C-alpha cells in the first residue's frame, strides 16, 4: 500500500541547518500535494507546509514562514523540507503526508502519514548519564512488597534504555518518560516492585545503556 | 552515482511458486534496466533487458515489469533451474548493480545439531587457541551465536562461516570460531558457546572447562 | 481575488495527455552538451564499406 | 558460440601492477565494445571500465579512474587492463563482457560475460597451512552421533583442497568457506558426523592440499 | 483513416501472465494518449487504464491496480498492457483507444476505439463438444411445422461454428448465443423450423467445427 | 467512483420515432459527459462530447442537452441505422460507463410457438439428462418460463439463452436448458416447461413423462 | 541577417505531385523548428504544415493531411515539402517561415518569412494572349483627356508585361491585375489617359510580353 | 531484425492511373528506406534510396515519400513497362526486405474454359494416377479448384500452378494435378473438378467415370 | 585533476584579428562540450560561447555573434575561438570552462574553469611610463609619519611592477590598480609611509619595470 | 534576456558570522541556478548546482535555497577561506551572471589619515599636473573626496583608484588624481581635497599654493 519513510532528522544547535526527506513508495507520487506536518508535546499537531504535485504552489504556517522551504523531487520521489534558523520551539516529530484523492471544487487535507522523524533543537553538548541508585529500606516498604529502581540523571540525547538483570527482569518494572530539565538534560526513573522477603539475597543490577554515547553502566541496588 | 537496492535480499520459495522480486534505484532510470541471473561459482547470465524485453533463449516463465525507478522481475512458475542469485541494473547513467537477491529453497523447519570443540594441544604450543562451535543440518538460517568466556561475552575476536544449502536436504551448516593468544587462553576456565534459533523453544548452551 | 490555499492540489486524471502541438520546436541550447558513455560502442553493420576515395 | 577466456590473474603485492587479457571467440571480436566488470564479497557487482569497438572511447569508475587503463588489440581479438598502484580492496574476480547489439540510438550494457579471473592484493607471504584435528569425545557426542573434523589454519595464499581418506569419504562431509584473518592468512574447518559405535576402530585422515607451495598434509583425527 | 488493431489476446489460466498489444496507423500515434477498456457481460464497459502520450502519467482502475501494467513503444508505434495475476472476473473483451484532441483546459476522453480482443480467464482445458441431437416428434409439432436442433454441450473454449447439412440449409436457422455453465464448459443449442411433411425422408445433419481442439462432428437427427 | 445510471434499460421504437434517452451521475459532472454507439459485434464509435457537441461525421439527427447530474440524448427522426446500444460516460473523474440502453424494433405482439424436447438416449448413456424447451418467434422479448418435475417447481438448475432481434422479421427465440444427472432424471416421472408471455390469453404448458 | 529562399514553385496540373524546397541561412537552420504557411485571394493566409527541428514531430493542417508531407535536410540547411493530389484550391503563395526562440514553456508561432514562391494549380495548357485594341473616340473623351488601352485576353500562365511605345510612356498608365476567368484563362486591361489634342498625330503602340510562350505583341491603338 | 510489410500485396491498375503501395516497419528505420524494382525472370533494378532520393536513370513518374515507420512509393503516370514486381528494403538494421508487391495489369472480366483429363493408360502402368483439370483464359486471378470423387471431397493430395500474365491478352491459366496410387484411383468410379469464379454466377463442373 | 590553459591573448588594434587556445588535460577532452566565458570590470561576467562535444552544434552570446567562431582539435585536445573584427568592449579576461557530468535531461553549465588569458583590444601604441615623484614635505607628516610615493602614468600596455629600494622597503607600500585614461594610457600610484625622522637622510628610489618596452626606471624622491 | 540581480552588492560580516545573499531573476528559471566563488586574482570555482545541491568537495557549511525567481546562499559559519566574491548564474535559457556579491571583512571604525602631493616639476615640463589625494587605513570603504581649486568645485576631471583590503589589517587606500593642462594649473592659486568619512565628525581639507 502506500508507504512513507522520513529521515533526516537529529540533533542541531540553535541557528542551524537541518534537510529532511521524506521518501514516497507505493503510488504515483508525482500525482499528490503533500504536507508536512509536526507534533511537539507543547502545541500538540500543528502544520507546517503544503506544496502542490508540480511545486508551483507552496504554503506556509505563520510560525515557520521565511525560514523553511519545502521543495520536491518527482524523479526521486522524494520530498524535501529545509529548515533554517531553527530555534528551540521547532523541536518536534515531524510527518510528511500525502492528501487525499477529492473531487475538483472540494477542499484537501491528508490521509496517509509517514512514520515520522525526530528533531531535537538544543544547545546540549553529547553526554553520557549520571546513574543513581534508589534503594529500599523500611521507609519505602508497606507489607511484603518493596520498591527499589535507578535514577537516569542528566543525560543528552534521547534516548536511553533500562533493563533489569539483562532483561530477565520484567514483570513490575515502570520506566517512567525522560522530562527536560532547566539545564537541557533529560533525566528519568527505572522502579521495579519486589518481594520484601528477597531483599539482601536476591542481586539486582540495572542496565543503562545510552548509544549516542557509547554508554554502558550496570549499577547494583543494595538496600540500606 | 545512481544506488540500486533490491528487495528482499532473500526469499526462501518452492518449486512451482511465483516469484517476484523489486529493484529501485536513486533517480529515474527511465527504462534502460537488466537483470542477470547468476549462480554459485558461474558467471552472470543475462535474462533481460529494456525492463521488459525477453533475451533471446530465456525461457517464458521469467518476465520483467516497472518503469521510472521501481522495477519488477517476475517468474510465473519457479523450477529447480531457476535456484540462483538475480541482480538488476541500471545502464541509464554509466552501471551500477543492485546487491543482489538469492532464492533460496524453501523446507520445513529443522533443529540445529549442536557441537563444540575445544583448542588442540598442538596450537596450544603454536601459540594460539581456537575454539570452534557447529550447528549441523539447521534452517532457516538465522541463528545467534554468543561466545562466553567465563560467563563473560566475546566481541571482536571471533569470525563466523556459513555454507551454502545442502543440495541433498536444503540445511545450513555454520562454524563459529573464537581466536584467543595462549595467555587469554589460559587465563580462563570455562568456555561455552550459546545458541538461539527460531526452531529452539529454550537457547542452547555447549560448554567446556580449559583442561578437563 | 486570492487563491484558495486548500484548494486540489493533485494532478488531474482527465487532463490533456495528447501532446501540445505548439510547444516548443527549437532545440535546447542548454541541454546535455557531452557524450553518452551507455551509447553505441559497437561498430555499425549499415557504415560505410568502401573507400574514401 | 561465443566464448570469453581470462588469463592473468594471481598474486600480486600492493603498489604493484598486472595486466588482465581475456580472448574473444566465436564472433568478431572488432565489431563489438567491451567492458570489465569486478565482483567482491564486500561491494557486490562493480563496473570497472568500457572500451569502444575501435578504442575511441573508454570510460571508468571514479573509484579506480588514473590507476586503471584498459585496451584492446583487434587484430590479436585480445582486450587488455593495466592495473597500477593496486589496492587491497581491489581483491575481486574480474570478468570481462560483450556489449549487446542493439539499436543506434538506445543505451547498452553486457549480454555476455567470461569465466572471471581472481585477483588477490594482499602483502602476506605465501604459507603452508597448520592442520589441527577437531578431536570427538563424550564432550561432542549426543547419541549415536558423534562430530569431528580438521582446521586448516594460517596459509596463503588461497586455494586449499582438503579430502577424507584420500576422496573415499564424501557423505556428510561440510567444508566451510575459507576466512581471511587480520594477518592476511586464510583459515577455514572441515567436519563430519559420523556413528560413535564406530570411533576407536574407522580410521580418520584429512588430506589437506596446496599446489602452490605443493604443500600435502595427512592428519589423522583421533578421539579423545 | 485512424485504425487500430489489437493482438495478444487467448485463454489463460488464472494467476498467470498475458500481454495484449495494439497497433495504431493513420495517424501520428506518439502525439496521442491511449486508454485500454474491457467490456462484459456481467459488469458492462469498465475502463482499465490510461497513458501519457510520453508515457510520463499513468492511471489504473482500482480494480487492477497493482496487477496491470500499461506502455507504450512510440518508435514501434504500438501499446502494449501487461496483465498479471489474472483473476476469473477479467475475462472480457479489451479495446485500445485514442483520446480525442481538444482544447488544453478541457477534460479528456476516447473518440475511436480499436477492433477488440477477447480475453478468457479459465481453468477449463481445451475439449471438444458433445453434440446430441433434438429429435422432432408429435410434442413437438404443431400443423405442418416441427422444430429439431443440435445440443453442442461441453466444450472450451469459445466459439464453435454450427451449420445445417453442409450449409444448405439455412432459412429458418436459429443458433443461440452460448452460455458459460458452473463447470466452466461452455454450451449452447441450434434449432431450425422444417415442413413435417418432410420428416423421415429428408436428413438433417448438423456439422460443429471447433477449430481450437480441431474438432469436427457431423450428428445426425432422426425423428421419433 | 462516480456511479452512472441508464435510463431506461431497453426502448421498443419505430422507425421515424421521436427517441429520449437519459443518463444520471451519482454526483455533479459539470458537462463532461460522452454518448457512445455499440452495434452488435462491433466496437463502440463517439457520438457526442461535452454533454451536446456533435462528433464530426455524426448526421444531424442527433442532439444532447443536460448539465450538472442530468442528461438526455434525443434522435429526432429514428432510422434503421440508428438500432443500437447507447452508452453515456462521464469523464469528469476518471471513467464510469452507464449500463447501456439498447434500441430495439418495435413491431406488433407475435406469440411464441413451444417446443419442448427430450433427452436423448446417448447424452443420458453419457451420464447427464438435458431437457430444453423452446419458444420461437416471439415478441416482445419478456417472457416466463418455469420448469416442473412432478408439479414441482425447479430453481437453480436451469439457463436461458435468448438471441437477438431477426434481421428479417425482428422476432426473438428463448431455449431453456434444464440439465440433471441421470440418477435425479430417473428418480422422477413428469417434465414439464410453462411459458407465459404478454401475447398469450393463456399459460402454455408442455409436459412428457420419463419413458414415455 | 536571416535570409530564406522559396524554389520550386510553378505551373502543375490536378493530380499531379511537386515539391517546394527553402534554402535557409544566416542562422543555424537545424537548431529552429519550421512552417510552411500559404497565402491565397480566396483564403488569405493558411498554415499548411509545421516540423520540429529534428523531425520527431510534424503537424498538418486539416485540409492537406493525408497529401503533404513535410522534411528538412540539416545537413543541407534546406525544408521541404512533398505535394501530393494537388487539387484547383492548393493555388496559392507558399512561404516557408521560422519559429522564434523563446521559453520552454511558451506557445510558438513564426517570426520571420521567407520571399515566397507562387504554385499554380490548373489543368489549362500554356497559350500566348490575344491583344485587341480599346479604341478612343468621342465617346472616350470629356474636355482634353482621352483614355485608350489594350485587352490581353485569354493567356496562360502568370504573368504577363505591358510597356507602351517601349517605355518611352510611363506617366498615367494604369495595368489592371489579371482576374480569372470561367474558362481557367487569365485576361487583364491597360488603359492609358492622353490628351486628346495628340490624337491622330501621336503613336501609342502597347508591347505585351510573355516570357513562358515567348510572346511578343506590338498593338498600335488607332482612333475611330 | 527489423521486420517489413507491404501492401497491398497484389495490385490491379491500368496503364496512366496512379499508383500508390504502402510499406510498414515493425521499429523506427529513420529514411533508411530503398525501393526496388523487379520484373519476372529478372534481376531486382534500384529505382530509390534514402526513401525519396531517385536513383539517375529512374524517370521522374516515381517518387518516394515517408519517415520513421510508414513509407509510401508512388507513380504518378502508369505506363505499360511499369508491370512488375516492387520491393521495399530498410537498411538502418542490417538488410531486410518486403514480400513484395505486384503491380496486375487490369482488363476485363472473363470467364475460364474448363477442361478434364483423366491419367493416361501408361501411367496407371507405371503405378501412378494424375488427374489434371485446367482453367484456361481466366480473370481475375481468383479462382477455386476443388476435386470431387464420387462426391466426396479431396484435400491434401493435390498441387496448383499458374501462369503469369499472358503478353498479348493478360490472361491467366491454371492447371490442377490430383495424384492417386494406382489402387486408390481404382477404388472409385467417378472423377470430377468443380470450379468457382467471381465471373461464374454457378459452379462449372466437369467429370469422368473410371475406365471410360 | 582537471586542468585547463589558456594561451594566445595579448595586444591587438581594433578590427584585428585573434585566435585564443585551451589545452586541456587531466580528463576525456572528447567528451565533454566547453565554454568560453569572459569577465570584464564593466560587465561582470558573460557568457561568450558554448560548443557541443563533437562540434555539431555551437551557440553565441548576442554581442559576438557573426563575429566570434569556437572550434575544436580533439586530437589535440584544444580548444579554439577565433575572434575577428574586435570592438573596444571586447577587451576582458577570457576564460574556458568544461561543461559538467549530469543527467540526460537536464540543464547544463560549466564547473571548471581555466586559468584565463587577458585581451587588451586598443588602438594605442607600445610607450614606456612617464615616472613622477610625489615628494614628501611638512604636509605630507602627521606624527612621526610621512607619505611618499612615485606616481607612473601614460604607458601602455600592462602591466609594470613598481618596487622600492630594489625590495628592500615593503612595510607600508600601497601600488595601486592601473586605471584607464581618456587617452587610452594607463596610470597608476604607489605610496609608502616611512618614518618621518629618516627624510633627508635616508634615500629611497622606486623601481619601475615594464618588461614589453623593457623599460627600468629608478626614480629618487626628494622633498622640496 | 533574463536579467540576473544580486544582493546585497557589498555585505560586511566577521569570522563566524552566519552570511545569507540572495539573487533574483527577471524571469522563473525553475531551479536552474548555481553558485560560483571567485578569489581575487583566481579563477572561479564551482560552488552550488541546482540552486541546492552541494558540489563534490565542498565544505557543509554552503547551502542554498530557492525556487522560481528567488534564491539565496548561506553561509552557516563564515571561516577566513570563504572571504570572496559570490556569482549567481541561471542556466535556464543560455547563460548571464550577476554581478557579483564581495563578502568584505567587517572592522571597527578608522578615520583615514590624509596626504596630499603636488605635481613635480618634471611633469610641469612635460605639460601636464597631476595632483594626487591620498587616504591611508581607513574604513569603511565609502568616503567622498572632491577637488577644489581656488574654492571652485572641479567635476569631470578626476580619476580614482582603490586598493584591496589589505592582508594585515584589513584596510583600505585609495588615491584620488586631479589631471589639468600646465595652463590651467599656473592659472590658480590654492589647490584642495576635502575628505568625508563616516569616522570624522567634519570634513578634512588639505591644500598647498602653487609654487609655495
Known amino acids: 500500500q502506500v508507504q512513507l519513510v522520513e529521515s533526516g532528522g537529529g540533533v542541531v544547535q540553535p541557528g542551524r541547518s537541518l534537510r529532511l526527506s521524506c521518501?514516497?513508495?507505493?503510488?504515483?507520487?508525482?500525482?499528490?500535494?503533500?504536507?508536512?506536518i509536526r507534533q511537539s508535546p507543547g502545541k500538540g499537531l500543528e502544520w507546517?507546509?503544503?506544496?502542490?504535485?508540480?511545486?508551483?504552489?507552496?504554503?506556509?504556517?505563520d510560525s515557520v514562514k521565511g525560514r523553511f522551504t519545502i521543495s520536491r523531487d518527482n524523479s526521486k520521489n522524494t520530498l524535501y523540507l529545509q529548515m533554517n534558523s531553527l530555534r528551540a520551539e521547532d523541536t518536534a516529530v515531524y510527518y510528511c503526508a500525502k492528501v487525499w484523492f477529492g473531487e475538483s471544487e472540494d477542499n484537501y487535507s491528508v490521509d496517509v502519514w509517514g512514520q515520522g522523524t525526530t528533531v531535537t533543537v538544543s544547545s546540549a553538548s553529547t553526554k553520557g548519564p549520571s546513574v543513581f541508585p534508589l534503594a529500599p529500606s523500611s521507609k519505602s516498604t508497606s507489607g511484603g512488597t518493596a520498591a527499589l529502581g535507578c535514577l537516569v540523571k542528566d543525560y543528552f540525547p534521547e534516548p536511553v534504555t533500562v533493563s533489569w538483570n539483562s532483561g530477565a527482569l520484567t514483570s513490575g518494572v515502570h520506566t517512567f518518560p525522560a522530562v527536560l530539565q532547566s539545564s537541557g538534560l533529560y533525566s528519568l526513573s527505572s522502579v521495579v516492585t519486589v518481594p520484601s522477603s528477597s531483599l539482601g539475597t536476591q542481586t539486582y543490577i540495572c542496565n543503562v545503556n545510552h548509544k549516542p554515547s557509547n554508554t554502558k553502566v550496570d549499577k547494583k541496588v543494595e538496600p540500606k | 552515482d545512481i544506488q540500486m537496492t533490491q528487495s528482499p535480499s532473500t526469499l526462501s520459495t518452492s518449486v512451482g511458486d511465483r516469484v517476484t522480486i523489486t529493484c529501485r534505484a536513486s533517480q529515474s532510470i527511465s527504462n534502460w534496466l537488466a537483470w542477470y541471473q547468476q549462480k554459485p561459482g558461474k558467471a552472470p547470465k543475462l535474462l533481460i533487458y529494456?525492463?521488459?524485453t525477453l533475451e533471446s533463449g530465456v525461457p517464458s516463465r521469467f518476465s520483467g515489469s516497472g518503469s521510472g525507478t521501481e522495477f519488477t522481475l517476475t517468474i510465473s512458475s519457479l523450477q529447480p533451474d531457476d535456484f540462483a542469485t538475480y541482480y538488476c541494473?541500471?545502464?541509464?547513467?554509466?552501471?551500477?548493480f543492485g546487491q543482489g537477491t538469492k532464492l533460496e529453497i524453501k523446507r520445513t523447519v529443522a533443529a540445529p545439531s549442536v557441537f563444540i570443540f575445544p583448542p588442540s594441544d598442538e596450537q596450544l604450543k603454536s601459540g594460539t587457541a581456537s575454539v570452534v562451535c557447529l550447528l549441523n543440518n539447521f534452517y532457516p538460517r538465522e541463528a545467534k551465536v554468543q561466545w562466553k568466556v567465563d560467563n563473560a561475552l566475546q566481541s571482536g575476536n571471533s569470525q563466523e562461516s556459513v555454507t551454502e544449502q545442502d543440495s541433498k536436504d536444503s540445511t545450513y551448516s555454520l562454524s563459529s570460531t573464537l581466536t584467543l593468544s595462549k595467555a587469554d587462553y589460559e587465563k580462563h576456565k570455562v568456555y561455552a558457546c550459546e545458541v538461539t534459533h527460531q526452531g529452539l523453544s529454550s537457547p542452547v548452551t555447549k560448554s567446556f572447562n580449559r583442561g578437563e | 481575488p486570492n487563491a484558495n490555499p486548500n484548494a486540489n492540489p493533485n494532478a488531474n486524471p482527465n487532463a490533456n495527455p495528447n501532446a501540445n502541438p505548439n510547444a516548443n520546436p527549437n532545440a535546447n541550447p542548454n541541454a546535455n552538451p557531452n557524450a553518452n558513455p551507455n551509447a553505441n560502442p559497437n561498430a555499425n553493420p549499415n557504415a560505410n564499406p568502401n573507400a574514401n576515395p | 558460440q561465443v566464448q570469453l577466456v581470462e588469463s592473468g590473474g594471481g598474486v600480486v603485492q600492493p603498489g604493484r601492477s598486472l595486466r588482465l587479457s581475456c580472448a574473444a571467440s566465436?564472433?568478431?571480436?572488432?565489431?563489438?565494445?567491451m567492458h570489465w566488470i569486478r565482483q567482491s564479497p564486500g561491494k557486490g557487482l562493480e563496473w570497472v571500465a568500457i572500451?569502444?569497438?575501435?578504442?575511441?572511447?573508454?570510460y571508468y569508475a571514479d573509484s579506480v579512474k588514473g590507476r586503471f587503463t584498459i585496451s584492446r588489440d583487434n587484430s590479436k581479438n585480445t582486450l587488455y587492463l593495466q592495473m597500477n598502484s593496486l589496492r587491497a580492496e581491489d581483491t575481486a574476480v574480474y570478468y570481462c563482457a560483450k556489449v549487446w547489439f542493439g539499436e543506434s540510438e538506445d543505451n547498452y550494457s553486457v549480454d555476455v560475460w567470461g569465466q572471471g579471473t581472481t585477483v588477490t592484493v594482499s602483502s602476506a607471504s605465501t604459507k603452508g597451512p597448520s592442520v589441527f584435528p577437531l578431536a570427538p569425545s563424550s564432550k561432542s557426542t549426543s547419541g549415536g552421533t558423534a562430530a569431528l573434523g580438521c582446521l586448516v589454519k594460517d596459509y596463503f595464499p588461497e586455494p586449499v583442497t582438503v579430502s577424507w581418506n584420500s576422496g573415499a569419504l564424501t557423505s556428510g562431509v561440510h567444508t566451510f568457506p575459507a576466512v581471511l584473518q587480520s594477518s592476511g592468512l586464510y583459515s577455514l574447518s572441515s567436519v563430519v558426523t559420523v556413528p560413535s559405535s564406530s570411533l576407536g576402530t574407522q580410521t580418520y585422515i584429512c588430506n589437506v592440499n596446496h599446489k602452490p607451495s605443493n604443500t600435502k598434509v595427512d592428519k589423522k583425527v583421533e578421539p579423545k | 483513416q485512424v485504425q487500430l488493431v489489437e493482438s495478444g489476446g487467448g485463454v489463460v489460466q488464472p494467476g498467470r501472465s498475458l500481454r495484449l498489444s495494439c497497433?495504431?496507423?493513420?495517424?501520428?500515434?506518439?502525439?496521442?494518449?491511449?486508454?485500454?477498456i474491457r467490456q462484459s457481460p456481467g459488469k458492462g464497459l469498465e475502463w482499465?487504464?490510461?497513458?501519457?502520450?510520453?508515457?510520463?502519467?499513468?492511471?489504473?482502475?482500482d480494480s487492477v491496480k497493482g496487477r496491470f501494467t500499461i506502455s507504450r513503444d512510440n518508435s514501434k508505434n504500438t501499446l502494449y498492457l501487461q496483465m498479471n495475476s489474472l483473476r476469473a472476473e477479467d475475462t472480457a473483451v479489451y479495446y485500445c483507444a485514442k483520446v480525442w484532441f481538444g482544447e488544453s483546459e478541457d477534460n479528456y476522453s476516447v473518440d475511436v476505439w480499436g477492433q477488440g480482443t477477447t480475453v478468457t480467464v479459465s481453468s477449463a482445458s481445451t475439449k471438444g463438444p458433445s453434440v446430441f441431437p433434438l429429435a422432432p416428434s408429435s410434442k413437438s409439432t404443431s400443423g405442418g411445422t416441427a422444430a429439431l436442433g443440435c445440443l453442442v454441450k461441453d466444450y472450451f473454449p469459445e466459439p464453435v461454428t454450427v451449420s445445417w447439412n453442409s450449409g444448405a440449409l439455412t432459412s429458418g436457422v436459429h443458433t443461440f448465443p452460448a452460455v458459460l455453465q458452473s463447470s466452466g464448459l461452455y454450451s449452447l443449442s441450434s434449432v431450425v423450423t422444417v415442413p413435417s411433411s418432410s420428416l423421415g425422408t429428408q436428413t438433417y445433419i448438423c456439422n460443429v467445427n471447433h477449430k481450437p481442439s480441431n474438432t469436427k462432428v457431423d450428428k445426425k437427427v432422426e425423428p421419433k | 467512483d462516480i456511479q452512472m445510471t441508464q435510463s431506461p434499460s431497453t426502448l421498443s421504437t419505430s422507425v421515424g420515432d421521436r427517441v429520449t434517452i437519459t443518463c444520471r451521475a451519482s454526483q455533479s459532472i459539470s458537462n463532461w459527459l460522452a454518448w457512445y454507439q455499440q452495434k452488435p459485434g462491433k466496437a463502440p464509435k463517439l457520438?457526442?462530447?461535452?454533454?451536446?457537441?456533435?462528433?464530426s461525421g455524426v448526421p444531424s439527427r442527433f442532439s444532447g442537452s443536460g448539465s450538472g447530474t442530468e442528461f438526455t440524448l434525443t434522435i429526432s427522426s429514428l432510422q434503421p441505422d440508428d438500432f443500437a446500444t447507447?452508452?453515456?460516460?462521464?469523464?469528469?473523474?476518471?471513467?464510469?460507463?452507464?449500463?447501456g440502453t439498447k434500441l430495439e424494433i418495435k413491431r406488433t405482439v407475435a406469440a411464441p410457438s413451444v417446443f419442448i424436447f427430450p433427452p436423448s438416449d446417448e447424452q443420458l448413456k453419457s451420464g447427464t439428462a438435458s431437457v430444453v424447451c423452446l419458444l420461437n418467434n416471439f415478441y416482445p422479448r419478456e417472457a416466463k418460463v418455469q420448469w416442473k418435475v412432478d408439479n414441482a417447481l425447479q430453481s437453480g438448475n436451469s439457463q436461458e439463452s435468448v438471441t437477438e432481434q431477426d434481421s428479417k422479421d425482428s422476432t426473438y427465440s428463448l431455449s431453456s436448458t434444464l440439465t440433471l444427472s441421470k440418477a435425479d432424471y430417473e428418480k422422477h416421472k413428469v417434465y414439464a416447461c410453462e411459458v407465459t408471455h404478454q401475447g398469450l390469453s393463456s399459460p402454455v404448458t408442455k409436459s412428457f413423462n420419463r419413458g414415455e | 541577417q536571416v535570409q530564406l529562399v522559396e524554389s520550386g514553385g510553378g505551373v502543375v496540373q490536378p493530380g499531379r505531385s511537386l515539391r517546394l524546397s527553402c534554402?535557409?541561412?544566416?542562422?543555424?537552420?537545424?537548431?529552429?523548428?519550421?512552417?510552411?504557411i500559404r497565402q491565397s485571394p480566396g483564403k488569405g493566409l493558411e498554415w499548411?504544415?509545421?516540423?520540429?527541428?529534428?523531425?520527431?514531430?510534424?503537424?498538418?493542417?486539416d485540409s492537406v493531411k493525408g497529401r503533404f508531407t513535410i522534411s528538412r535536410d540539416n545537413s543541407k540547411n534546406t525544408l521541404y515539402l512533398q505535394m501530393n493530389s494537388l487539387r484547383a484550391e492548393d493555388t496559392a503563395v507558399y512561404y516557408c517561415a521560422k519559429v522564434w526562440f523563446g521559453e520552454s514553456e511558451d506557445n510558438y508561432s513564426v517570426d520571420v518569412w521567407g520571399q515566397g514562391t507562387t504554385v499554380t494549380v490548373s489543368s489549362a495548357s500554356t497559350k500566348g494572349p490575344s491583344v485587341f485594341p480599346l479604341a478612343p473616340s468621342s465617346k472616350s473623351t470629356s474636355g482634353g483627356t482621352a483614355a485608350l488601352g489594350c485587352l490581353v485576353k485569354d493567356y496562360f500562365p502568370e504573368p504577363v508585361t505591358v510597356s507602351w511605345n517601349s517605355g518611352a510612356l510611363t506617366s498615367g498608365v494604369h495595368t489592371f491585375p489579371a482576374v480569372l476567368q470561367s474558362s481557367g484563362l487569365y485576361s487583364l486591361s491597360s488603359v492609358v489617359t492622353v490628351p486628346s489634342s495628340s490624337l491622330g498625330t501621336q503613336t501609342y503602340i502597347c508591347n505585351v510580353n510573355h516570357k513562358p510562350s515567348n510572346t511578343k505583341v506590338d498593338k498600335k491603338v488607332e482612333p475611330k | 531484425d527489423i521486420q517489413m510489410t507491404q501492401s497491398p500485396s497484389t495490385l490491379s491498375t491500368s496503364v496512366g492511373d496512379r499508383v500508390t503501395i504502402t510499406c510498414r516497419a515493425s521499429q523506427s528505420i529513420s529514411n533508411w528506406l530503398a525501393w526496388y524494382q523487379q520484373k519476372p525472370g529478372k534481376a531486382p533494378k534500384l529505382?530509390?534510396?534514402?526513401?525519396?532520393?531517385?536513383?539517375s536513370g529512374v524517370p521522374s513518374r516515381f517518387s518516394g515519400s515517408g519517415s520513421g515507420t510508414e513509407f509510401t512509393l508512388t507513380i504518378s503516370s502508369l505506363q505499360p513497362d511499369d508491370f512488375a514486381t516492387?520491393?521495399?528494403?530498410?537498411?538502418?538494421?542490417?538488410?531486410?526486405?518486403?514480400?513484395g508487391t505486384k503491380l496486375e495489369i487490369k482488363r476485363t472480366v472473363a470467364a475460364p474454359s474448363v477442361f478434364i483429363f483423366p491419367p493416361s493408360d501408361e501411367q496407371l502402368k507405371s503405378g501412378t494416377a494424375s488427374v489434371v483439370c485446367l482453367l484456361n483464359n481466366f480473370y481475375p486471378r481468383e479462382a477455386k479448384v476443388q476435386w470431387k470423387v464420387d462426391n466426396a471431397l479431396q484435400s491434401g493430395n493435390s498441387q496448383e500452378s499458374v501462369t503469369e500474365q499472358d503478353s498479348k491478352d493478360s490472361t491467366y491459366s491454371l492447371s490442377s494435378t490430383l495424384t492417386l496410387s494406382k489402387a486408390d484411383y481404382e477404388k472409385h468410379k467417378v472423377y470430377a473438378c468443380e470450379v468457382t469464379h467471381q465471373g461464374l454466377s454457378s459452379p462449372v463442373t466437369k467429370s469422368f467415370n473410371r475406365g471410360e | 585533476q582537471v586542468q585547463l590553459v589558456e594561451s594566445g591573448g595579448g595586444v591587438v588594434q581594433p578590427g584585428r584579428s585573434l585566435r585564443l587556445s585551451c589545452?586541456?588535460?587531466?580528463?576525456?577532452?572528447?567528451?565533454?562540450?566547453?565554454?568560453?566565458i569572459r569577465q570584464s570590470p564593466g560587465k561582470g561576467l558573460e557568457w561568450?560561447?558554448?560548443?557541443?562535444?563533437?562540434?555539431?552544434?555551437?551557440?553565441?552570446?548576442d554581442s559576438v555573434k557573426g563575429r566570434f567562431t569556437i572550434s575544436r582539435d580533439n586530437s589535440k585536445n584544444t580548444l579554439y575561438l577565433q575572434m575577428n573584427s574586435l570592438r573596444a568592449e571586447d577587451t576582458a579576461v577570457y576564460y574556458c570552462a568544461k561543461v559538467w557530468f549530469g543527467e540526460s535531461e537536464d540543464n547544463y553549465s560549466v564547473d571548471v574553469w581555466g586559468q584565463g588569458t587577458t585581451v587588451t583590444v586598443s588602438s594605442a601604441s607600445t610607450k614606456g611610463p612617464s615616472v613622477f615623484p610625489l615628494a614628501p614635505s611638512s604636509k605630507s607628516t602627521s606624527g612621526g609619519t610621512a607619505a611618499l610615493g612615485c606616481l607612473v602614468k601614460d604607458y601602455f600596455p600592462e602591466p609594470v611592477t613598481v618596487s622600492w629600494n630594489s625590495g628592500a622597503l615593503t612595510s607600508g607600500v600601497h601600488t595601486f590598480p592601473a586605471v584607464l585614461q581618456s587617452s587610452g594610457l594607463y596610470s597608476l600610484s604607489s605610496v609608502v609611509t616611512v618614518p618621518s625622522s629618516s627624510l633627508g637622510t635616508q634615500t629611497y628610489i622606486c623601481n619601475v619595470n615594464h618588461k614589453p618596452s623593457n623599460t627600468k626606471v629608478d626614480k629618487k624622491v626628494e622633498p622640496k | 534576456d533574463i536579467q540576473m540581480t544580486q544582493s546585497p552588492s557589498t555585505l560586511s560580516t566577521s569570522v563566524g558570522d552566519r552570511v545569507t545573499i540572495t539573487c533574483r531573476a527577471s524571469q522563473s528559471i525553475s531551479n536552474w541556478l548555481a553558485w560560483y566563488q571567485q578569489k581575487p586574482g583566481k579563477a572561479p570555482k564551482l560552488?552550488?548546482?541546482?540552486?541546492?545541491?552541494?558540489?563534490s568537495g565542498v565544505p557543509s557549511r554552503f547551502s542554498g535555497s530557492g525556487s522560481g525567481t528567488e534564491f539565496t546562499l548561506t553561509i552557516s559559519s563564515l571561516q577566513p577561506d570563504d572571504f570572496a566574491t559570490?556569482?549567481?548564474?541561471?542556466?535556464?535559457?543560455?547563460?548571464?551572471?550577476?554581478?557579483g556579491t564581495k563578502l568584505e571583512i567587517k572592522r571597527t571604525v578608522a578615520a583615514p589619515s590624509v596626504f596630499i602631493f603636488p605635481p613635480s616639476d618634471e611633469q610641469l615640463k612635460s605639460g601636464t599636473a597631476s595632483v594626487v589625494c591620498l587616504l591611508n587605513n581607513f574604513y569603511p570603504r565609502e568616503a567622498k573626496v572632491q577637488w577644489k581649486v581656488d574654492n571652485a568645485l572641479q567635476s569631470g576631471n578626476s580619476q580614482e583608484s582603490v586598493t584591496e583590503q589589505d592582508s594585515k589589517d584589513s584596510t583600505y587606500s585609495l588615491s584620488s588624481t586631479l589631471t589639468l593642462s600646465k595652463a590651467d594649473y599656473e592659472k590658480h592659486k590654492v589647490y584642495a581635497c576635502e575628505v568625508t568619512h563616516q569616522g570624522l565628525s567634519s570634513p578634512v581639507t588639505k591644500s598647498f599654493n602653487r609654487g609655495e
Open positions: 572500451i569502444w569497438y575501435d578504442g575511441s572511447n573508454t
Open positions: 529494456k525492463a521488459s
Open positions: 566465436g564472433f568478431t571480436f572488432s565489431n563489438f565494445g
Open positions: 541494473q541500471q545502464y541509464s547513467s554509466y552501471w551500477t
